[PDB]
Amino acid sequence: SCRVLPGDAAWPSSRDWAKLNKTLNGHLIATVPQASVCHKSPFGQYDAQACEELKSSWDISTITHVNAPGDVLSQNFQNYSCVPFTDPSQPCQLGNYPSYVVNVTGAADVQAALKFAQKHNVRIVIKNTGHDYLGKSTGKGALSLWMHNLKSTKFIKNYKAPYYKGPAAKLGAGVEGFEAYAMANSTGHRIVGGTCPTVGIVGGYTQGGGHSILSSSYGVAADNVLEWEVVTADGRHLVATPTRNSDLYWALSGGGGGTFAVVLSMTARLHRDGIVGGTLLGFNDSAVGNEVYWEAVAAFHALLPDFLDGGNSFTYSVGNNSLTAYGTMPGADRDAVDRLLRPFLDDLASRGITPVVQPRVSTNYYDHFFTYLGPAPYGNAAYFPFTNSRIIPRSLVTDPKSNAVVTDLFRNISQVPAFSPFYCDSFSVADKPHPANSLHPAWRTGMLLCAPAGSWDWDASPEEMAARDRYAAETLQPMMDAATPGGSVYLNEANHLYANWKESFYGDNYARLLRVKKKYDPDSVFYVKTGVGSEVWDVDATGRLCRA
Ligand SMILES: *Cc1cc2c(nc3c(=O)[nH]c(=O)nc-3n2C[C@H](O)[C@H](O)[C@H](O)COP(=O)(O)OP(=O)(O)OC[C@H]2O[C@@H](n3cnc4c(N)ncnc43)[C@H](O)[C@@H]2O)c(*)c1C
Ligand SMILES: *[C@@H]1O[C@H](CO)[C@@H](O[C@@H]2O[C@H](CO)[C@@H](O)[C@H](O)[C@H]2NC(C)=O)[C@H](O)[C@H]1NC(C)=O
Ligand SMILES: *[C@@H]1O[C@H](CO)[C@@H](O)[C@H](O)[C@H]1NC(C)=O
Ligand SMILES: *[C@@H]1O[C@H](CO)[C@@H](O)[C@H](O)[C@H]1NC(C)=O
């Protein structure tokens, strides 16, 4: 059995879709890609100047793009079907985009869409922001549950349970980083969220784990979830906590989005705000030569433990001849910032390097975040659609023998132009209180999460971009894996073609994750590439989803 596609005898009629729309109170949207304004047909609405506006920031994570119902940010998944950078005469086609989008207002819209889809054998897709690097928030011929507009927030002053007492926030499924930060800040709190401000904090970010510059202080985003409000495949409106539907709670808190249930909201721990120490710390090989530069990168890595165990973090960009780091030091006044940086600066001084060091103390976390990752509120985060990753164990770094292999990996990757420079985050998320969840164990032993990320080139041919896609999956990622035994790959930052996904994403947790999948979705209504239980479905040459 296969899901239906447009053209099939069993594709729902115009009356069937109109019936669904009536049930949804007019909230069904026939998908019109945002870049239809760049083409004359089949939508008649070529607007040359509106098209130039889309070109200007198409490869950036913009609120304008995220606001579009049927769109996705990945240039690879757009796949030239309806894009700004082909000729106006080339027809705008849906390709990987869903055929219809449900503008979800609450639980009933989801229940009605699920029931319709099971009745008519339509593929369900779930999309929040369209950030997903693996194409998991789009799909050909699908009915998409668009969660973007569930923006409600609610401060809970005294959340009270065995697992947590303190302030919390209930956030709707569509709440993005910038909105969560604005809400948390308004009450003098912080929340654990991603570095890219348009990222959907309640969607794939937290559901897949979600690292943060506050992770050394408060753990992974998944660690901070108190409750998940969901709709199951069979339409049940449930709440999953550590003591209620707790197997579902466990799976949702790190098991990856788009497979266990449809999330309507989450409730997450808030944390007391206060001053935040910051710095730019940068150095290069210009005075001292490339070999010493790499020895300095290696020693920088080996000095991180004490810094990270104090609740602090570095997010840094590793280039072939220079490194630029951004330090986050919660509650560190100026004297304390200098004391925390001193070992790093003493080491660089002993190798002949004069670094660029620009410390600061921000009054609150919101200001700190947007000093380095702004401008507020939306940032300017570039979308690199060949994103790979590795969670690297501390033990690899602290043993200078295995750390030499790590440095050799970084040097090798630094020599590949499309994937260089690249960002790394650093964290210690062991030994903190959290409810039991399905985060890969590698997170706990982990110290670095590095994301070599290939850019898209609109002047290249489709075959060249396909070849880069394949290179990332079958050459670069396995090279990263072999250099970092004991690590894992972060399921949110990987290539859709990566063959070893099951082992690297889920490891020993897969058995239990799969039992939760089969319990809450026995008919496999939910599918995402590399998702738990995704092996039930296969995509054929046409993009049709068929049972394996
Ligand atoms: C684009 C981008 C992504 C980033 C950036 N920075 C990050 C960082 O500093 N740390 C991180 O840990 N991650 C970073 N990410 C990655 C994002 O965390 C992931 O790409 C998330 O998977 C994206 O989440 P979301 O914003 O929800 O994007 P979608 O593509 O809409 O969905 C992803 C995935 O999750 C499922 N899903 C979303 N919402 C739901 C609900 N309500 N219910 C069920 N399932 C849901 C989707 O089906 C899909 O599979 C920096 C940048 C620039
Ligand atoms: C972009 O579209 C092309 C087809 O126009 C897709 O090519 C298919 O790729 C798969 C492997 O992923 C092959 O096994 C199929 O034979 C190809 N199909 C055809 C018809 O050539 C390609 O997958 C699309 N890219 C993305 C990222 O969706
Ligand atoms: C659903 O109904 C609304 C309100 O009349 C309409 O604007 C919209 O175009 C309809 N959607 C579809 C897919 O027909
Ligand atoms: C989605 O629904 C909300 C609330 O009903 C509405 O404000 C918004 O304009 C809708 N979006 C689109 C694109 O129709």
Numbering used by the authors: 27 to 574
Paper text:
In the present study we report the discovery and the structural characterization of two novel flavoprotein oxidases from the thermophilic fungus M. thermophila. VAO-type proteins are composed of a FAD-binding domain and substrate domain. In both MtVAO615 and MtVAO713 the cofactor FAD is covalently tethered to the protein by covalent linkages.
Rcryst/Rfree are 19.5/23.5 and 23.6/28.0 respectively. The groove shaped substrate binding pocket of MtVAO615 is solvent accessible and contains, besides His157 and Cys222 which tether the FAD, Tyr159, Thr221, His237, Thr341, Tyr352, Leu399, cis-Pro401, Ala402, cis-Pro403, Ala408, Phe410, Thr413, Tyr449, Asp451, Leu475 Ala477, Ala479, Glu519. On the other hand, despite having a bicovalently bound FAD cofactor, access to the active site of MtVAO615 is rather narrow. In particular, Phe410 and Tyr449 seem to create a sort of funnel.
